[PDB]
Amino acid sequence: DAFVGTWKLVSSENFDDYMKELGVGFATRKMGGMAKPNCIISVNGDVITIKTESTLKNTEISFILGQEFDEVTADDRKVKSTITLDGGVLVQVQKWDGKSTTIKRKREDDKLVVECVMKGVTCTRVYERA
Numbered sequence: 571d572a573f574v575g576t577w578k579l580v581s582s583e584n585f586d587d588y589m590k591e592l593g594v595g596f597a598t599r600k601m602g603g604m605a606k607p608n609c610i611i612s613v614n615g616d617v618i619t620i621k622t623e624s625t626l627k628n629t630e631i632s633f634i635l636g637q638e639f640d641e642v643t644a645d646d647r648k649v650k651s652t653i654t655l656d657g658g659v660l661v662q663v664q665k666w667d668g669k670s671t672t673i674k675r676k677r678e679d680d681k682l683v684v685e686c687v688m689k690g691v692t693c694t695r696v697y698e699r700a
């Protein structure tokens with residue numbers, strides 16, 4: 571859709587604070603905050619795949635909209651994830667240990683805009699086509 575492609579991180583706001591809320595420790599936050607990952611999004615039938623590639627860490631999730639799945643996050647959390655399409659926005663919720671975080675991926679102009687919320691912390695990451 572508007573989401574399919576290869577997307578390179580070009581900007582990030584409040585990622586260190588978000589990682590802190592995720593319980594990521596200092597040395598790991600340092601490494602994560604300088605990463606400039608590629609995000610490759612593809613769709614085949616029901617199944618959407620989101621691949622993250624960086625020198626620090628690669629991740630991949632494949633999923634069906636509305637169908638909860640198990641995910642190991644980049645920072646090694648074991649979470650229950652559910653992703654839906656809401657007014658053109660991919661909305662992801664991860665739930666683990668009575669906590670949750672929400673990740674919204676939207677297409678705005680040339681950009682893929684990713685908004686991550688946990689507790690009072692909102693991080694916004696902007697990716698552009700590679």
Ligand SMILES: Cc1c(Cc2ccccc2)nc(C(C)(C)C)c(-c2nnn[nH]2)c1-c1ccccc1
Nearest residue numbers: 598599601602605607622624626627644645673
């Ligand atoms: C939480 C998180 C972490 C945690 C982490 C920190 C430090 C070391 C290892 C993990 N790391 C990454 C890197 C840079 C490492 C891939 C991401 C990420 N994925 N796509 N773009 N950025 C996210 C992330 C960002 C937005 C949406 C979903 C996940």
